[PDB]
Symmetry: C3
Subunit: 472 residues, 3 copies
């Protein structure tokens, strides 16, 4: 039987509300997430970049290895349920003393002892010490599977979000490229006018200050682009030359409708990998409580031998050397003065720690779901605000250029109008790809399509087809 205590996970009680992540003019959605959710961005550059991650990402490989390690440990603990067989052979020579109690000859005794045979050893699993040890590893392996799914979701999400940050950086670098192009022209015009006394030193300094400031901002954008370029290569590449010299082809993100949840699911506990992993790690420690409690109970051991024994090597495999034995041992602790009690206590405390870990995983998840839903619909508003702001500042700049060209506006006010448009355009870019990443955060928080009910082992094998483990 088994001494494992009944595992009582309290029900997660919460209300559903699909208006939580939906704007008033938006459709309330609780639809499920597709497994390959990233293809809904209609970006083939992104698709190829994700496939590179699912192939080359080392963190994902480590998670796969951790899973295999857990399976290997599972196999080891299963063997403990079966009787072990070993072969042995020995030879020895001894001078037995005259005063030795086993010596009745009154003389010095020289003798040999040669042995050879098969050995049987088996601990009778009466109280489920070895079954629950095995079942603990089984729970551990399932936890490693869920941890792998969590790692896959994390790697894919990080890859998508780094990609969009990179595109964000390309757009800002390009918007700052032209802003510097015109800054060169504007200065060159005022430089020509200064040589003929058409502008003063003050205005020329303003034109020059604008030129250098734009150049400084331009190079900052290049730097910011390089950072996310590096971050994407590290997540996806295995080619050292690609990492060193190559760049990344990309596609501008344009606003569209996304089939993502707008409220928390009724089966969220079965849809997040980390929750499932945390669950399995709890029952793992629960089985280990049973293992610890068997120490209070009697242990039964079976030993057997079949082979040969002789005082002479020449007669070792003779008929007169044939020997065997079989034995059962029954040991039972009486007073260990708290040793076993505190060990069971320690096992119970490890379960408590696993339970608290589970609760914290639950709290954090629900915290992530709340923010992700609110952030998505809030940034959605920002998309309209930043778009309209950029258009307004662009129109202001257009009128400013007209007035400046016919001397009806100072250079200072004209330069300010340019900067304001630049800021608005950059801000709109930042909002645009913050919204793209906000879609990912929602998908990430809801599990990315993971379902605990499905065949976890079969799903993992199918989705890990292209994982590069050629190294072994």
């Amino acid at each position: 039987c088994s001494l494992s205590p009944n595992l009582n996970i309290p029900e997660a009680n919460y209300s559903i509300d699909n208006k939580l992540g939906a704007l008033s003019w938006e459709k309330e959605t609780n639809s499920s997430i597709t497994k390959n959710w990233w293809k809904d961005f209609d970006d083939e550059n992104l698709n190829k970049v994700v496939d590179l991650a699912l192939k080359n990402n080392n963190d994902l490989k480590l998670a796969f290895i951790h899973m295999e390690q857990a399976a290997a440990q599972l196999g080891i603990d299963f063997s403990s349920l079966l009787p072990k067989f070993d072969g042995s052979a020995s030879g020895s020579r001894a001078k037995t003393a005259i005063n030795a109690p086993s010596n009745r000859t009154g003389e010095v005794s020289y003798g040999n002892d040669f042995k050879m045979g098969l050995n049987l050893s088996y601990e009778i699993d009466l109280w489920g010490k070895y079954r629950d040890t095995y079942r603990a590893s089984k729970s551990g392996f399932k936890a490693s599977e869920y941890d792998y799914e969590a790692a896959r979701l994390s790697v894919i999400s990080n890859t998508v979000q780094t990609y969009f940050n990179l595109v964000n950086a390309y757009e800002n670098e390009n918007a700052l490229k032209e802003a510097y192009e015109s800054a060169k022209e504007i200065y060159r015009i005022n430089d020509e006018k200064f040589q003929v006394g058409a502008v003063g030193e003050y205005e020329l300094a303003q034109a020059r200050a604008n030129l250098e400031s734009m150049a400084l901002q331009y190079n900052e954008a290049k730097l910011n682009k390089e950072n996310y370029l590096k971050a994407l290569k590290i997540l996806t590449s295995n080619d050292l030359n690609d990492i060193l010299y190559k760049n990344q082809s990309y596609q501008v993100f344009n606003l569209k409708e996304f089939d993502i949840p707008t409220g928390i699911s009724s089966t969220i506990l079965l849809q997040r990998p980390d929750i499932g992993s945390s669950l399995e790690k709890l029952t793992q420690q629960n089985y280990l409580v049973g293992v610890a409690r068997t120490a209070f109970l009697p242990s039964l051991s079976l030993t057997g031998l079949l082979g040969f024994e002789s005082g002479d090597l020449d007669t070792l495999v003779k008929g007169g050397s044939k020997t065997w034995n079989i034995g059962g041992n029954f040991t039972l602790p009486i007073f260990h003065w708290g040793e076993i009690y505190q060990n069971v206590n320690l096992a119970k405390l490890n379960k408590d720690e696993a339970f608290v870990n589970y609760q914290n995983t639950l709290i954090t998840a629900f915290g992530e779901i709340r923010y992700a839903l609110v952030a998505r619909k809030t940034i959605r508003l920002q998309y309209d605000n930043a778009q309209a702001s950029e258009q307004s500042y662009k129109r202001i700049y257009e009128i400013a250029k007209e007035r400046y060209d016919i001397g009806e506006m100072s250079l200072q006010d004209y330069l300010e109008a340019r900067q304001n448009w630049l800021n608005a355009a950059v801000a709109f870019n930042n909002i645009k790809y913050s919204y793209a990443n906000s879609i990912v955060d929602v998908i990430k928080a809801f599990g990315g399509g993971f379902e605990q009910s499905e065949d976890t082992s079969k799903n993992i094998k199918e989705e890990s087809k292209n994982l590069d483990m050629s190294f072994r």
Copy 2:
């Protein structure tokens, strides 16, 4: 009875100075910290959210469990100081070969052996191998207690500072709400004037750009508010609906004076939990050095049996089957070619590592104290600066509005003056609660009222009264 070396912790030598964190017009204070320092903010909402943390925080629960685990290991190692008693029963059958040296009959020998009785097993702790193993665990438990105190202070401080960051987020959001409302009114006016030809396309675009900019800044403030709301929920709540849908009632921080240190304490080593924890972990490793050195010395093992033995089961508990034995065994390593010597070295290096960890904890603590004190008084100055700045920019706005309404100021200049007030108002909010959190940092750096000399176990039990451990009850 012990091979543990003398533990020689060098003294921490430093000068005291109560002007380090005190302004020239401020009183230099070296008063101690009350256990529940957070109630001096006079915020009932803050008090409630701290109690929720002390009740529901899972990191606090983990720290409590880690302490209980250390107590359990302490109980395990205590048992090794006492003789163990076990019961045993066995039965075996054997075909002893003719050629077996033990066989004198010249014939195949079948025989049985049945045993049953009580067993004694006791390791004589001549050199304190098990005494120091116990003492190491005792120091490990004491370290877990100090780690719990450190975790408690950390959880409380984080909860308080998250609360204030949340209130800061509410204030900026509300300020940006009004800034958005009037900006919408500004555009509505300029939109009406446009259709009757009272304003140009240029001015209408400026009013619209201002409207969208404010709306963008507004939603950012909401987003920043939601971020700290989530942070507070995770720290204090065990209700999933509360986490998902509820908000947080709060109270604006008003500038008062707090009874906090302005200079480093003369007993700072006894007032920080992390220093005490780091200390106990050092003595723990020191005891383990002694344990490792006992391997060089002779070990003595005592065994005893009282029970029965017979070649037949039917006479197993008969009188002629009664038997007993008592045994002692000395073992002494002679040549192990560095095995034991390097194990002692390894144990001594573990102690060195714990010493370096202690030094680093000391250095970090003093660094935190310096910054916390200087930051507190510097941000105190910033409070007056940001308040006066906000008032000046507000008066500027009030005049700029009067002038714009009678057409004596361009819309652009008017929108700018208004944006400047908003910036100054937000900046003052940020300074206000950065000062509130600066108070906490000082309190945190000085241990939050912890005193090592007190009964830690009694204190821990008293202060963990409301800790929710009902999941195992």
Copy 3:
């Protein structure tokens, strides 16, 4: 013999390109790095603070101890290759039952048994179980040496970059100090003029607003200074009073050319300590594969005794009590139902994990090298942009001050011109010391002068002469 598999590390294939980190008007360089590279900043204040770090930094001490611990473990595993010798002595008194099989006297038997002598125990390392255990620990020690070199490079680089961040903070605090002094006088003038009706409330408010704003920015700069002051103290100091009360003498960074790589080295694998560490940790796990595989093969044990035995303590060391024995024992597992096989799998997977760790180290390293090179040459361009920008905004301020003093410019146009100069000066400060730290990033990413071919143990001993281990 050994059962360790042949380790096959794939070649790191990549192209060289000295233009990667070189501007068009710079000389492309592939020159190696001097081991004390920080002295090329010509800063004596920086030199003393690095020496303090190399003496007092606790992370550096921990890495030194970790190396010593690995050395101790190596000594332990060396001993397992040699026969052990132990002394023993025992005494037992037993009432042997009448029914006991060994008792053929028909009556209760009381008897003693006393033993004393030297014991031999030796595991014949036929399959390299203990030799590869030893060789694994040796690789572990060499890995710890490289980890120390990596820690040394890390501590030094952090100390230098923290120093430059501190000087950046001091320079900005000084710039905001003088800006505060000017703002205090500007307000004082307007305050005087106000009470004689020479300026209005609107202008006075602008003067006060500018004054309080500068005061807020000034005190913020102090805070930023104190933060990097603390960070430097923790990295370098062991004196509590110094940490609490003292400040840091410094030296302004002046632009100069530095002899650093502009392209990736052809021997970068031998120049980065962290790569060498990952390599050694891989061979370590490789040797352990062999160790695990020895469990399949027969273990041979040698046992010996030389001493005494008697049923009487009075005759224990007499001639008739002299006894000895010698023996060999073979053990060979037959059926273990996966236990050993899965243990080998587990060991194989630990090697795979170490391989993935190595690969990830390579990818990260090449990513760091790419960014460090591009950042260096880009911030180099920014240096000229920020310098020219600051000088332009300074000239604008000078002309603006002239016009304001004769009433030909409004107060807030003059205050704006002041703030713009301050911003440009602070920005140029940030760029200046971001460039200094960009130099360090390049040196750091290239190993900081480390060469794997050199006598690692000799180098470590020589470069750690000032490491304060006086506590022991």
